[PDB]
Amino acid sequence: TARGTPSRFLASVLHNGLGRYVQQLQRLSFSVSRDGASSRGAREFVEREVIDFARRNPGVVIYVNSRPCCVPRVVAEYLNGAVREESIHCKSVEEISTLVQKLADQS
Amino acid sequence: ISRKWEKKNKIVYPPQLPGEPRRPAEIYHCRRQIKYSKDKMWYLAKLIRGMSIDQALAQLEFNDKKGAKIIKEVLLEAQDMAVRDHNVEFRSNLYIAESTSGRGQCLKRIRYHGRGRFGIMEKVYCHYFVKLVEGPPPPPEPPKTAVAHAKEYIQQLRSRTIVHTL
Amino acid sequence: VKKGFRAAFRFQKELERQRLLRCPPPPVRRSEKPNWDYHAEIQAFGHRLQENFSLDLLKTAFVNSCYIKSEEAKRQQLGIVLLNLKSNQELSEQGTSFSQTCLTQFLEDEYPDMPTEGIKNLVDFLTGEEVVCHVARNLAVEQLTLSEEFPVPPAVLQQTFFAVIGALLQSSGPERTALFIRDFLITQ
Amino acid sequence: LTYFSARKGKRKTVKAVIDRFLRLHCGLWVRRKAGYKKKLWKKTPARKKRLREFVFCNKTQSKLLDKMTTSFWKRRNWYVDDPYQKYHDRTNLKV
Amino acid sequence: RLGFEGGQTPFYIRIPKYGFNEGHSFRRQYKPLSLNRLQYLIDLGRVDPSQPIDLTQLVNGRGVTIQPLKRDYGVQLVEEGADTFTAKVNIEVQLASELAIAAIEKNGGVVTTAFYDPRSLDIVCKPVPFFLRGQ
Amino acid sequence: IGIRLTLPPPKVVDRWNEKRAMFGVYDNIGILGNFEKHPKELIRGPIWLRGWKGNELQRCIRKRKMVGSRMFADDLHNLNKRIRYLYKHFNRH
Amino acid sequence: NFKRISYAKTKTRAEVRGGGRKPWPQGRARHGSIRSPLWRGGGVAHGPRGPTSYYYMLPMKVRALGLKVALTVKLAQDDLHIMDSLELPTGDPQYLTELAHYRRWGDSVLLVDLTHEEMPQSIVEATSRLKTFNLIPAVGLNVHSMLKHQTLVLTLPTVAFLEDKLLWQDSRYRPLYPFSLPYSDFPR
Amino acid sequence: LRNRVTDRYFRIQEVLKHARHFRGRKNRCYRLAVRTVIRAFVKCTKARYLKKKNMRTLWINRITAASQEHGLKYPALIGNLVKCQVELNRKVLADLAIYEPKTFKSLAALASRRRHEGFAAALGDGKEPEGIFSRVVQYH
RNA sequence: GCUAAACCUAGCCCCAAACCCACUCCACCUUACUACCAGACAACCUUAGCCAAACCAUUUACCCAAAUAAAGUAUAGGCGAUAGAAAUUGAAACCUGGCGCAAUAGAUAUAGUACCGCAAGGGAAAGAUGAAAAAUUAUAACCAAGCAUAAUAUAGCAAGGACUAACCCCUAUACCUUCUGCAUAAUGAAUUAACUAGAAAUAACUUUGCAAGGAGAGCCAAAGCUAAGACCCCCGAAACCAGACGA
RNA sequence: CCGAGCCUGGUGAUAGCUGGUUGUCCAAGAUAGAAUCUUAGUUCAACUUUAAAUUUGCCCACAGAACCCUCUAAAUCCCCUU
RNA sequence: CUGAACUCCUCACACCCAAUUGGACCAAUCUAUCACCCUAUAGAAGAACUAAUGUUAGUAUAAGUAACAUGAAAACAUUCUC
RNA sequence: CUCUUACUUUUAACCAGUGAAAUUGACCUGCCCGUGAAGAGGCGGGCAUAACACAGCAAGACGAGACCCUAUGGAGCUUU
RNA sequence: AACUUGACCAACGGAACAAGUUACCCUAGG
Ligand SMILES: [K+]
Ligand SMILES: [K+]
Ligand SMILES: [K+]
Ligand SMILES: [K+]
Ligand SMILES: [K+]
Ligand SMILES: [Mg+2]
Ligand SMILES: [Mg+2]
Ligand SMILES: [Mg+2]
Ligand SMILES: [Mg+2]
Ligand SMILES: [Mg+2]
Ligand SMILES: [Mg+2]
Ligand SMILES: [Mg+2]
Ligand SMILES: [Mg+2]
Ligand SMILES: [Mg+2]
Ligand SMILES: [Mg+2]
Ligand SMILES: [Mg+2]
Ligand SMILES: [Mg+2]
Ligand SMILES: [Mg+2]
Ligand SMILES: [Mg+2]
Ligand SMILES: [Mg+2]
Ligand SMILES: [Mg+2]
Ligand SMILES: [Mg+2]
């Protein structure tokens, strides 16, 4: 550590939930390799999971960029300007589904 | 080795707009591989920090230490360079913004001890760095007054929150 | 020299982080960065707020007069089709008018014993540049705003926020817009 | 025990073991009783009879003897009219 | 070292010497060939009863494995399987039991016991390697 | 300190150079060639390590046996010393 | 690995130059030698002691089974093409390259003919200028090459040769002596 | 094949990033830092036990002070509130004392009333009826 | 901001294949490198001690001409440790390569030099621009310890919990080794960087193959046999022996 | 630092006893005995690991285990049920 | 009444025993094949260091400390003192 | 020596130049009592306490600084 | 010849067979 790290108080963005609930996640950017063992899970996620997630979260804009990469990543951007980059390297579809939904629910 | 100090004079700023206040000129100068210890040189560099160019030259002129003459020559070179190459108007309108000493490249020599042990003596060298800024010396920050102390203490009391509760 | 690539590459990325922190680049608009599609961003803006915005009206809300002038100057100097872009001036007037009267009715009902001077000052604070710009930034309004200068000047950002409220007023009517005023301005 | 001979780099047999023990193919080791030939005059007939028996070694001893001998001493042999032929194979041993 | 108990006389040393293995390398050994095995070999066409059966035919049909370097002196015919032995054969072995001889004779076959020396046994068991020596 | 400040020259491996393209060819010379030749005959290398494997002690013993007479004086002296050192080491002396 | 010979070798403390004496600096024993592994320039305590052989042999039947599996895997995945012959209309490599592309063979093709001597000159000339189109005799067939090349091309005579050699392992006796020596039914 | 660690720098930075705020050479020399960092991490793990203990001690101190303002000792308030089937924990009671003084005075008055009912019952032989606030609600 | 940092080559290692070397002129066994006087001196002779037997007293090794096998068998031996055949058997071998090192590595080697020693002998350290230096005000910088920029404010293994708040409050007897499982008493460490220490495959187990047979001669086999996988560290005496060097 | 020089080699000599022995996670995991020129060490024991096979293991009802004088109590061995 | 890592409570749950053994995972390196802003599946090995009375290099502390040095004047000619 | 005193030189201290070594786990380095304590700067209780050079001192920390037995080891030399 | 016999090997799980001394000491850790 507490002494070695920063801290903050419990807070919300724009009093979210007081009048209405707004999903803070607005953008997800995926980088996926067409070829690359580490992107196998990300490729499978794009085939069978991304479309259903996109419909469930119309407020979020999802960019899927297929290009050569060794480490596939998902960049999550929020309404308050926060940018959170995560790695989906060698993650299964279930693990990627869990991470993506976790990003969707964070403020 | 590193020679960044020499390159600082090569920075070129964009032409200032008429509204902008006139930017004070900055001159960077140094002397490498002075035959002197940085520890001894530090006291001389410290002494002239914040002084005007004339006040620094006066103090160094009557200083007995060997480093004083060396720093005085560097200061005179920096003063001449400021007016000639950096478009400084008045040579006296300069003050010591930064003055420090740095460890030079030292030489190790075979030395001896009174009982026949073999020793290494280092021949010490140092660097002297100076930065001159156009304008009068910035006034020294005044002493903290009683009124300032009271204001700080009352401010601390007013910032108190009820700790570890709702 | 130690043979290997992974450690050197990792240290290169480390050095790049310091090169960024030592000289933080000049902030730029989100629209210039990668992974940006304006039409998709506009559609998400409405759905995110659970509002049935008219896309044609919502797009006009983000068009500021300053942007139209700057675009014309760029086109003329780089001689190259008539541009019929409508600015958000008309929408921002309707939104500003509705917001002032909508907030007044809200406050007068809640605080009947408040003097008119008090009610006006509250409406000025809620619609003030400070409050509105803070709300607009946290609702992705600045990302969709079309302006000549970035970061969007406070005055331009406030004008765009009320222009969006004007677009909502035409799209969904006064009752729906009032709940938008309550959820994002009364909460402030 | 030599695990790697100087000239062949092969494990060696302890010849002391070959002199004193018989290994049945089933893994049992047979030996004589110590002192079976010594001081018979001061030993009772019952003691003398058990001293001339051929007895088996325990598990711990058998494993040690196995390490001290190379695979050649553990091969199956078909000697003509071998007195210990029948004992090489176990019968009705459930374990 | 292995076999050292830390001071006392080791177990493998305190046991008296007895000639269990004395002269083992000079003892003669005979691989056992049973009537069951011989009948099984004939049934599967690996030994042909219509010709004289000797060590060469037994080895060629993979019926027995002879190691002359391990003091094997040939095959010893054993009576196991005599009750069910039905083949009529002319077979040459090195040793045969009384019951084994009776089983072959009862079917009209002929059994003879012959001696091969270490050099002869090596040649008879593997003729082709011998012929390649050029002797 | 201790880590290179620049990237090393990019590694470019030709996967389809003649050596890689023909690797493994004739490893079945015996199975497919009437066993006229054994695969171990393909092995190139020290005369004392062709189609044979062993620990360091066994290798040193084998090398001295096969080429010991042709070795240089100092090399042979080192080999003899190594064998004696390894003989004690591998026999737990 | 079976034909791998590693030539890496280091020097032990007994092989490094000098170091025989006990260093005098004040007893002499505190360090036994200046070439101790702990000393800069000393011997390597546990370094490679080559040349080191990795030779071993899989059972003959296992190596034969590997060839069967590789052939079966290629056919099951539509990577095996059978040719009547490897005769070509011309010796130009561009023809063979275009032919493989038109038939969707793949980036790399292994061409297997019955015998080295009777290989058609046209296919010999074409494949000699191609890096990924490799021509080998039937005796050279091996699992590594088959896996390295995406496509396997066998001539009809090669198929009969392969089946004869590999099936022989299934029905053969245990060996009395090496199959190089004469047998009643081998070869043929 | 000779192998040497090439990423030791990152291994050291993992320790050092936790020692930046330390004093002296502990904050930069790895061999000194690691030992201090290990002690810090151990203290951080154990402190979670002390955090709960000290927080409860703080609530009791504040509840004691709040109770004394109404003439009630801490054991009287806590125990008697339990006898009224009021299960407010110490953290909430401390929060109430600070931010809800009127409600806290009521709780103190309720505890004082229940305490007096206990005194009257102790003097009685049980023939009389129980106090109004003494009556316990039963659950099944 | 200094000190510094960073680098990729010099070469080297292990194999393969091939049997190497050396008289410009002059000088050189006397005090070598000294143009030029009666010589006469002549070489040959078991290695030893000792790794081990937990001492040591007989006893163990370093060569003699083909991989493999016979075989760790015969045999020798305080019959202990340990040593260890032969008859017989009988293969391949195409230099120009590397899952070798890359400046504390790899040769000691930039060099047997500097330096140390009377002598035998011992024996280092280190270099880094670029296409062009007949482009040098060009080759940006960012990184260890050490410092500088910038000394310090009650209180205590220097932190942790935290806090509006650096400190003040509360909590906390550095670590390692060893002594019984007990270091505030004994050991070790200025700090940074680099270097620095577990090497068997018989059996058994596991996973394939084939199976009364297995194995690419030899060997094993009363479900075996073949193949693979996986097990045995670093530094640190006196002494002893051989041959030199030194008054 | 010569109670027997120095150097090289034998030599990574031997013994003795310290010291050191480098990523993570999960599972199991602390015994206290006998012989020995042996007690600063070792090997059979005690405890301990992995895998495998099979069937009881622990706790414990009655009955039962010496006379000779037992300090003679506290206990032990054995042992179904549970 | 206060008062544990005991117990309960919301959630989680394989995450506190040396040596040792068993089962997984893994930094970097090289090789095969992938990959192509730094990866994957395997094969391999000089494969990971706050624990050294260890080696080499750099730089501290002690410390600007201990210690070291040039007889006098002058015109620098010379003279004077010892 | 009672019983030391004075002066000179050196050292010394200050200024200027040059500039070592042993040592050093880290250090934000107090006292009393207690704790095995005459084993406590660091633990318990109590007391004390703004910060920071220089010159001394030598109570403590800290360092510069024989004998014992044990090992199935030697070497001289002495012989019963 | 065989059947058999024999070490107070008493340091008695027994090395086939060997003492003093070092205050000139050498080496070893505790
Ligand atoms: K060197
Ligand atoms: K002389
Ligand atoms: K006087
Ligand atoms: K005390
Ligand atoms: K003192
Ligand atoms: Mg040597
Ligand atoms: Mg080396
Ligand atoms: Mg509690
Ligand atoms: Mg021979
Ligand atoms: Mg070198
Ligand atoms: Mg201590
Ligand atoms: Mg230690
Ligand atoms: Mg003389
Ligand atoms: Mg466990
Ligand atoms: Mg029972
Ligand atoms: Mg619990
Ligand atoms: Mg290593
Ligand atoms: Mg001092
Ligand atoms: Mg002095
Ligand atoms: Mg003087
Ligand atoms: Mg006196
Ligand atoms: Mg001075």
Cα of B36 from ligand 22 centre, angstroms: 13
- Of all nucleotides, the one whose C1′ comes closest to residue E7's CA is J36
Cα of D95 from ligand 15 centre, angstroms: 24
Q: First-to-last CA distance in chain B?
A: 58
Q: Give CA–CA dist C80/C71, Å, rounded.
A: 13
Range of the domain at G150: 1-187
- Of all nucleotides, the one whose C1′ comes closest to residue A67's CA is K36
Cβ–Cβ of H99/B164 closer than 8 Å?
Answer: no
Q: Which residue, among C58, C86, C72, has the nearest Cα to C145 in the 3D structure? A: C58
Instruction: Say how far residue G106 (Cα) sits from the centre of its chain.
Output: 22
Q: In what order do the strands lie in the sheet with D55-56?
A: D22-23, D29-31, D55-56
Distance from CA of C183 to the nearest CA of H (A): 28
Estimate in Å the CA H51 to C1' I173 gap, whole number.
22
Q: Give CA–CA dist E21/D17, Å, rounded.
A: 10
Q: Which residue, among E32, E37, E42, has the nearest Cα to E87 in the 3D structure? A: E42
Task: Map tokens 């009391």 to a residue.
Answer: B157
Residues in F lying within 8 Å of D, measured between beta carbons: 54-55, 57-58, 61-62, 83, 87, 90-92
Estimate in Å the CA G33 to C1' I158 gap, whole number.
44
DSSP state of F53: -
Q: Give CA–CA dist F71/F48, Å, rounded.
A: 13
Q: Give CA–CA dist C60/C169, Å, rounded.
A: 14
Please report, for residues D17, D72, E6, the alpha-carbon distance to residue E3 in angstroms, rounded to integers and kept in the order given: 10, 20, 9
Paired strand residues for E77: E33, E96
Q: Give CA–CA dist A88/A99, Å, rounded.
A: 9
Give C6's contacts in chain H (Cβ within 8 Å): 6-7
Report helix, strand and coil shares of chain E as percent, to nearest 5. 35, 20, 45
Cβ–Cβ of F32/G179 closer than 8 Å?
Answer: no
Domain spanning B1-166: CATH 2.40.170.20: no
Q: Give CA–CA dist E70/E24, Å, rounded.
A: 11
Residue B29: CB less than 7 A from any atom in strand I: no
Q: Give CA–CA dist F77/F91, Å, rounded.
A: 21
- H104, amino acid identity: F
Residue F26: CB less than 7 A from any atom in strand J: no
3-state secondary structure of F21: helix
Cα of E52 from ligand 18 centre, angstroms: 112
Residue F93: CB less than 7 A from any atom in strand J: yes
Cβ–Cβ of G131/F21 closer than 8 Å?
Answer: yes
Cβ–Cβ of C5/F5 closer than 8 Å?
Answer: no
- D61, amino acid identity: Q
3-state secondary structure of A85: strand
Locate breaks in chain G with C to N over 2.5 A; list the residue preceding each: 26
Residue H49: CB less than 7 A from any atom in strand K: yes
Contact in structure between B35 and B101 (CB atoms under 8 Å)? no
Residue E135, classified by CB atoms within 10 Å of its CB into exposed (0-12), middle (13-18) or buried (19+), is exposed
Distance from CA of C134 to the nearest CA of A (A): 9
Cβ–Cβ of C8/F8 closer than 8 Å?
Answer: yes
Contact in structure between E71 and E28 (CB atoms under 8 Å)? yes
Which own/partner contact pairs does H3-12 have at CB distance under 8 Å and 24+ positions apart? H4/C2, H6/C2, H6/C3, H6/C4, H6/C6, H6/C7, H6/C8, H6/F3, H7/C6, H7/C7, H7/C10, H7/F3, H8/F2, H9/C7, H9/C11, H9/F2, H9/F3, H10/C7, H10/C10, H10/C11
DSSP state of A30: E
Where do the domains of chain B lie? 1-166
Peptide bond into G187 cis (omega under 30): yes
Instruction: Say how far residue C67 (Cα) sits from the centre of its chain.
Output: 14
- Of all nucleotides, the one whose C1′ comes closest to residue E11's CA is J44
Distance from CA of E58 to the nearest CA of G (A): 12
Neighbours of B108 (CB within 10 A): 9
Number of domains in chain G: 1
- Would you state the structure tokens that stand for residue F32, as one six-digit string? 């497919």
Q: Give CA–CA dist D25/H5, Å, rounded.
A: 53
Estimate in Å the CA A84 to C1' I114 gap, whole number.
62
**Type and span of the H or E element at A84:** strand A83-87
Optimal mutation site among H1, H2, H4, H7, interface C, most CBs of chain C within 10 A: H7
Q: Give CA–CA dist C85/G101, Å, rounded.
A: 52
CA dihedral G96, G98, G99, G102 (to 10 degrees): 160
Distance from CA of H95 to the nearest CA of B (A): 6
Cβ–Cβ of F53/G54 closer than 8 Å?
Answer: yes
CA nearest to H1 within chain C: C3
Structure determination method: cryo-EM
Contact in structure between F2 and G123 (CB atoms under 8 Å)? no
The torsion angles phi and psi of H110, rounded to 5 degrees, stand at -65, -40
- Would you state the structure tokens that stand for residue F52, as one six-digit string? 């044979």
Residue E6: CB less than 7 A from any atom in strand J: yes
User: Who contacts G111 (Cβ-Cβ below 8 Å, separation ≥6)?
Assistant: G86, G123, G127, G133, G134, G135, G136, G153
Q: How many CA atoms lie within 13 A of E80 on its CB side?
A: 9
Estimate in Å the CA H9 to C1' I70 gap, whole number.
60
User: Who contacts B90 (Cβ-Cβ below 8 Å, separation ≥6)?
Assistant: B83
Residues near chain L strand, CB within 7 A: B 35-37, 40, 64-67, 111, 113, 117, 119-124; H 23-26, 32
**Resolution to 1 decimal, in Å?**
2.6
Please report, for residues G137, H85, H113, the alpha-carbon distance to residue H132 in angstroms, rounded to integers and kept in the order given: 107, 13, 10
Neighbours of E82 (CB within 10 A): 19
Residue E77, classified by CB atoms within 10 Å of its CB into exposed (0-12), middle (13-18) or buried (19+), is buried
Distance from CA of H19 to the nearest CA of A (A): 8
Q: Give CA–CA dist C1/B11, Å, rounded.
A: 35
Q: Give the torsion sign (CA, F11, F16, F22, F27).
A: positive
Range of the domain at H39: 1-140
Alpha-helical (H) ranges within C84-153 are 89-110, 116-126, 129-137, 141-144
Query: HEC profile for H71-93?
Result: CCCHHHHHHHHHHCCCCCCHHHH
Strand M positions within 7 A of protein Cβ atoms:
4-6, 13-14, 27-28
CA angle B54, B56, B61 (to 5 degrees): 95
Cα of G35 from ligand 10 centre, angstroms: 13
Out of C34, C40, C182, name the one closest to residue A61 (CB): C40
H65 at interface of B, judged by CB pairs closer than 8 A: no
Q: Which residue, among H74, H77, H136, H73, has the nearest Cα to H106 in the 3D structure? A: H77
Q: What is the DSSP secondary-structure string of chain B?
A: ---HHHHGGG--PPPPPTTSPPPPPEEEEEEEEESS-HHHHHHHHHHTTT-BHHHHHHHHHT--SHHHHHHHHHHHHHHHHHHHHS--S-TTSEEEEEEEEEE---EEEEEE-TTS-EEEEEE--EEEEEEEEESSPPPPPPPPPHHHHHHHHHHHHHT----S--
Q: Which residue, among B94, B116, B103, B108, has the nearest Cα to B50 in the 3D structure? A: B94
- H1, amino acid identity: L
Strand K positions within 7 A of protein Cβ atoms:
1-5, 27-30, 32-41, 43-50, 52, 54-56, 58-60, 64
